[PDB]
Design an enzyme around this catalytic site. Structure first.
Site, mmCIF file in Angstrom:
data_model
loop_
_atom_site.group_PDB
_atom_site.id
_atom_site.type_symbol
_atom_site.label_atom_id
_atom_site.label_comp_id
_atom_site.label_asym_id
_atom_site.label_seq_id
_atom_site.Cartn_x
_atom_site.Cartn_y
_atom_site.Cartn_z
ATOM 1 N N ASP A 32 13.337 53.498 34.957
ATOM 2 C CA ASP A 32 13.292 52.082 34.544
ATOM 3 C C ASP A 32 12.757 51.184 35.612
ATOM 4 O O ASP A 32 12.008 50.255 35.312
ATOM 5 C CB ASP A 32 14.666 51.599 34.087
ATOM 6 C CG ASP A 32 15.151 52.341 32.866
ATOM 7 O OD1 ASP A 32 14.378 53.184 32.331
ATOM 8 O OD2 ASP A 32 16.305 52.132 32.476
ATOM 9 N N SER A 33 13.100 51.461 36.861
ATOM 10 C CA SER A 33 12.594 50.690 37.984
ATOM 11 C C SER A 33 11.083 50.710 38.129
ATOM 12 O O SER A 33 10.508 49.676 38.477
ATOM 13 C CB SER A 33 13.233 51.158 39.286
ATOM 14 O OG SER A 33 14.516 50.565 39.405
ATOM 15 N N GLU A 34 10.441 51.862 37.912
ATOM 16 C CA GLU A 34 8.989 51.971 38.005
ATOM 17 C C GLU A 34 8.323 51.150 36.912
ATOM 18 O O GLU A 34 7.357 50.433 37.155
ATOM 19 C CB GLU A 34 8.555 53.457 37.911
ATOM 20 C CG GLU A 34 7.046 53.704 38.009
ATOM 21 C CD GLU A 34 6.326 53.183 39.242
ATOM 22 O OE1 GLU A 34 6.993 52.755 40.212
ATOM 23 O OE2 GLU A 34 5.077 53.194 39.237
ATOM 24 N N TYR A 35 8.860 51.224 35.705
ATOM 25 C CA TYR A 35 8.350 50.398 34.612
ATOM 26 C C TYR A 35 8.435 48.912 34.989
ATOM 27 O O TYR A 35 7.475 48.141 34.803
ATOM 28 C CB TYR A 35 9.177 50.676 33.366
ATOM 29 C CG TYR A 35 8.839 49.747 32.227
ATOM 30 C CD1 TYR A 35 7.726 49.974 31.426
ATOM 31 C CD2 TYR A 35 9.557 48.575 32.028
ATOM 32 C CE1 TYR A 35 7.352 49.072 30.448
ATOM 33 C CE2 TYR A 35 9.204 47.674 31.040
ATOM 34 C CZ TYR A 35 8.100 47.918 30.261
ATOM 35 O OH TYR A 35 7.838 47.032 29.276
ATOM 36 N N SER A 81 13.684 47.912 -4.220
ATOM 37 C CA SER A 81 15.052 48.290 -3.929
ATOM 38 C C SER A 81 15.171 49.739 -4.252
ATOM 39 O O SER A 81 14.268 50.325 -4.845
ATOM 40 C CB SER A 81 16.033 47.494 -4.793
ATOM 41 O OG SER A 81 15.972 46.109 -4.499
ATOM 42 N N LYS A 116 20.383 56.323 5.961
ATOM 43 C CA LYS A 116 20.208 54.971 5.429
ATOM 44 C C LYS A 116 20.861 54.040 6.436
ATOM 45 O O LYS A 116 22.077 54.057 6.575
ATOM 46 C CB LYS A 116 20.863 54.794 4.053
ATOM 47 C CG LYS A 116 20.473 53.447 3.462
ATOM 48 C CD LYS A 116 21.050 53.143 2.099
ATOM 49 C CE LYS A 116 21.011 51.649 1.785
ATOM 50 N NZ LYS A 116 19.721 50.985 2.169
ATOM 51 N N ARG A 137 12.416 40.755 4.090
ATOM 52 C CA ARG A 137 12.211 41.229 2.740
ATOM 53 C C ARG A 137 12.446 40.055 1.759
ATOM 54 O O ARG A 137 11.691 39.892 0.791
ATOM 55 C CB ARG A 137 13.164 42.384 2.424
ATOM 56 C CG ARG A 137 13.129 42.765 0.974
ATOM 57 C CD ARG A 137 13.889 44.008 0.688
ATOM 58 N NE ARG A 137 13.724 44.369 -0.721
ATOM 59 C CZ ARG A 137 14.374 43.809 -1.741
ATOM 60 N NH1 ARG A 137 15.267 42.843 -1.529
ATOM 61 N NH2 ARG A 137 14.138 44.206 -2.982
ATOM 62 N N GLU A 174 13.674 48.705 8.946
ATOM 63 C CA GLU A 174 14.936 48.000 9.088
ATOM 64 C C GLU A 174 15.178 47.694 10.547
ATOM 65 O O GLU A 174 15.003 48.556 11.407
ATOM 66 C CB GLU A 174 16.107 48.827 8.497
ATOM 67 C CG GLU A 174 16.581 48.282 7.154
ATOM 68 C CD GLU A 174 17.578 49.136 6.392
ATOM 69 O OE1 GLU A 174 17.302 50.340 6.183
ATOM 70 O OE2 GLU A 174 18.627 48.591 5.974
ATOM 71 N N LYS A 315 11.519 57.452 -26.411
ATOM 72 C CA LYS A 315 10.264 57.301 -27.121
ATOM 73 C C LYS A 315 9.870 58.596 -27.842
ATOM 74 O O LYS A 315 10.288 59.685 -27.445
ATOM 75 C CB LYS A 315 9.169 56.883 -26.132
ATOM 76 C CG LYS A 315 9.446 55.546 -25.435
ATOM 77 C CD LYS A 315 8.271 54.580 -25.595
ATOM 78 C CE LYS A 315 8.516 53.198 -25.035
ATOM 79 N NZ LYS A 315 8.537 53.180 -23.544
HETATM 80 C C1 LIG Z 1 15.036 46.993 34.618
HETATM 81 C C2 LIG Z 1 14.759 47.709 33.318
HETATM 82 C C3 LIG Z 1 13.478 48.129 32.993
HETATM 83 C C4 LIG Z 1 13.237 48.869 31.856
HETATM 84 C C5 LIG Z 1 14.274 49.217 30.995
HETATM 85 C C6 LIG Z 1 14.036 50.183 29.859
HETATM 86 N N1 LIG Z 1 12.635 50.619 29.743
HETATM 87 C C7 LIG Z 1 12.196 51.690 30.480
HETATM 88 C C8 LIG Z 1 10.943 52.205 30.357
HETATM 89 C C9 LIG Z 1 10.606 53.401 31.195
HETATM 90 N N2 LIG Z 1 11.548 54.032 31.891
HETATM 91 O O1 LIG Z 1 9.440 53.793 31.236
HETATM 92 C C10 LIG Z 1 10.092 51.594 29.376
HETATM 93 C C11 LIG Z 1 10.507 50.519 28.661
HETATM 94 C C12 LIG Z 1 11.819 49.951 28.845
HETATM 95 O O2 LIG Z 1 12.195 48.891 28.359
HETATM 96 C C13 LIG Z 1 15.575 48.760 31.273
HETATM 97 C C14 LIG Z 1 16.730 49.016 30.341
HETATM 98 C C15 LIG Z 1 15.787 48.024 32.440
HETATM 99 O O1 LIG Z 2 9.960 51.576 -1.723
HETATM 100 C C1 LIG Z 2 10.494 52.250 -0.838
HETATM 101 O O2 LIG Z 2 10.020 53.392 -0.423
HETATM 102 C C2 LIG Z 2 11.759 51.816 -0.147
HETATM 103 C C3 LIG Z 2 12.373 50.613 -0.502
HETATM 104 C C4 LIG Z 2 13.527 50.255 0.130
HETATM 105 C C5 LIG Z 2 14.082 51.081 1.134
HETATM 106 C C6 LIG Z 2 15.280 50.808 1.842
HETATM 107 C C7 LIG Z 2 15.740 51.672 2.797
HETATM 108 C C8 LIG Z 2 15.047 52.835 3.102
HETATM 109 C C9 LIG Z 2 13.886 53.151 2.431
HETATM 110 O O3 LIG Z 2 13.222 54.307 2.687
HETATM 111 C C10 LIG Z 2 13.376 52.271 1.437
HETATM 112 N N1 LIG Z 2 12.229 52.632 0.784
#
Ligand SMILES: Cc1ccc(Cn2cc(C(N)=O)ccc2=O)c(C)c1
Ligand SMILES: O=C(O)c1ccc2cccc(O)c2n1
Ligand SMILES: Cc1ccc(Cn2cc(C(N)=O)ccc2=O)c(C)c1
Ligand SMILES: O=C(O)c1ccc2cccc(O)c2n1
Lengths: 318, 318
Positions: A32-35, A81, A116, A137, A174, A315
């Site tokens: 994380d530090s290198e990033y 849905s 889900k 949505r 989601e 039908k």
């Molecule tokens: C200080 C700091 C920097 C980065 C991260 C998490 N992280 C790490 C990398 C990584 N390792 O390549 C890439 C994206 C990212 O968000 C945290 C939690 C804290």
């Molecule tokens: O139309 C769909 O494929 C559709 C629609 C609603 C969803 C909600 C949760 C997870 C899914 O894969 C869903 N997929």
């Protein structure tokens, strides 16, 4: 050509790749530090040479100004849905109905199975690989523009990881808050004498309706992509699992518990497996989403419009 | 009190009752000539004493002026679609799914079964027994105002036949053109060098989109009521069949082939019976509509929103 433009390009490329490895692969190649070393080196350079600042750079996730009000977006393709089931017998009846409704039932009947999630359904648009819009949505037809809030989500790429991205690609997924993030947030809320969230879904929902992107950024939200809406300038795979694997291979976060299952009894095994893993996932789930994997079979089966579950039109055959 | 007002009231009452007997009961108590004698006696009296002309009188079905354009109506309660089946196995799978989805499956499981007509879905509003508005189904959410066209349909009462009508009652049904009427219309169209209609559904659809009520009136359209939308100021029966019987007992045309069937094998017998009667009905049908008869069970089962037939969410029990 200039040295500083090349240094920026290289920093951005590197940083996008490390984000992919950390967020999507769950196998970062550097600490994380290198990033962080490179991230604030890019941020400082960009501020010292603003002529080369890009809108999709990794340092540009948070809009410095809070919004006044969310605009409404009508979805080009509606967000549907899902039908639901509550028992093995009910699921078995659902498969038996597809089995006789299909023209040619293949052997095996393969399903793409996933957990889900208990989260907020969103739609994210990439135009020539760049994130341009994101929407809730809403009612499935119209939603709210939450682009600025979605841009703050760390595992959401501002640019697709491919040299030939689609002309337009709409990713559906989601947004949720994992358990560790939810616990952290409530300790911070309590330590700073502010209100707590009852559950991760309420916390994620509240975070996405913030008008200040600066607040959303402090909320540990995660996207998990489960579908595609618009897809122009690309030949999408002919299976649902291959389409999710393709999203993942171009930088989009997809759930790693997704499997393929041949027939109802295997699908029921997955459901019991996921049901047993609940205690170990680290995020909330409500069930499993079970889909016919073959795309031509989905198209053949089609949709059911808003209809009662208590009536059916049998039908006559021609 | 005046003699002429009493003579008008008596004529209208008599004429509405003969229309009920002819159209709904299919058992008129007087010849067509007697009905016509009184009908044009009422029309002449009303024209000689216009002070006592009422908008819902039996002589007032046709608006003398053609319309300019149909206004749009948003339905208070949306008009849903029906799920469909194409085989005994598929229907059996549909029942088996309801059987396990229900909390308490009764013995027997009764269905209200009807023929599925090939017609135009409409919604008709009665306010304190009087017909005030009618609309096309349209997309299920919004339709066109076809009140003037619906008022021309002979079996549609302009006034409900009850001394205590509901505050508001919305009747839902299908407008269609029987075979004899369709054949007559095409002989008239050909004899008067005008275009013919390919089938009864196209003829009914074309007749309802006429802006001139005078043209619709010459088209032999029939309503068959299959449902209720809004129902204020009334205690609707607790079975679907009893609700249709109640519509019929207050003057609304309902299909006479409707039956009750206990369990899937009886429902399948009805389907084969109706399939065999097709040659003898005198109007077009596409199948049968099979509904759970008990209203509390319909409410328990509920609706399915626009969803794919290829996916299902198997939720976990709490
Ligand atoms: C200080 C700091 C920097 C980065 C991260 C998490 N992280 C790490 C990398 C990584 N390792 O390549 C890439 C994206 C990212 O968000 C945290 C939690 C804290
Ligand atoms: O139309 C769909 O494929 C559709 C629609 C609603 C969803 C909600 C949760 C997870 C899914 O894969 C869903 N997929
Ligand atoms: C001349 C004429 C008058 C009436 C009818 C049909 N009809 C008859 C009665 C009736 N018998 O009580 C009631 C209403 C109605 O529309 C036709 C076809 C022709
Ligand atoms: O929601 C309904 O009950 C409904 C909806 C649409 C229909 C179409 C034809 C026949 C029916 O009984 C129908 N019923």
């Amino acid at each position: 050509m200039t040295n500083i433009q090349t240094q920026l390009d290289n920093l951005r490329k590197t940083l996008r790749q490390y984000e992919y490895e950390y967020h999507v692969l769950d196998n970062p190649s550097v600490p994380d530090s290198e990033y962080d070393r490179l991230f604030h080196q890019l941020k400082a350079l960009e501020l010292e040479h603003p002529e080369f600042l890009t809108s999709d750079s990794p340092t540009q996730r948070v809009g410095a100004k809070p919004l006044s009000g969310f605009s409404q977006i009508r979805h080009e393709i509606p967000m549907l849905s899902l039908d639901n089931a509550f028992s093995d017998a009910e699921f078995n009846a659902f498969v038996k109905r597809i089995e006789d409704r299909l023209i040619l039932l293949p052997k095996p009947l393969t399903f793409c199975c996933e957990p889900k999630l208990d989260g907020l359904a969103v739609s994210i648009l990439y135009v020539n690989g760049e994130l341009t819009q994101a929407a809730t949505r809403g009612d499935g037809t119209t939603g709210e523009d939450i682009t600025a809030n979605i841009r703050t989500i760390r595992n959401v790429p501002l640019q697709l990881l491919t040299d030939n991205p689609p002309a337009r690609l709409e990713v559906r997924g989601e947004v949720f808050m994992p358990h560790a993030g939810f616990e952290r947030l409530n300790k911070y809320a309590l330590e700073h004498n502010e209100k707590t969230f009852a559950n991760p879904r309420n916390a994620a929902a509240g975070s996405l309706r913030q008008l200040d992107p600066n607040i959303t950024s402090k909320r540990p939200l995660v996207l998990n992509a489960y579908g595609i809406g618009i897809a122009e300038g690309v030949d999408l795979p002919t299976t649902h699992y291959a389409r999710l694997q393709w999203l993942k291979s171009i930088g989009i976060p997809v759930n790693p518990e997704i499997r393929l299952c041949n027939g109802a009894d295997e699908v029921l095994g997955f459901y019991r497996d996921i049901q047993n893993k609940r205690s170990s996932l680290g995020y909330d789930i409500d069930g499993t989403v079970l889909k016919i994997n073959d795309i031509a079979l989905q198209n053949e089966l089609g949709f059911i419009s808003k209809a009662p579950r208590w009536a059916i039109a049998y039908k006559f055959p021609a």
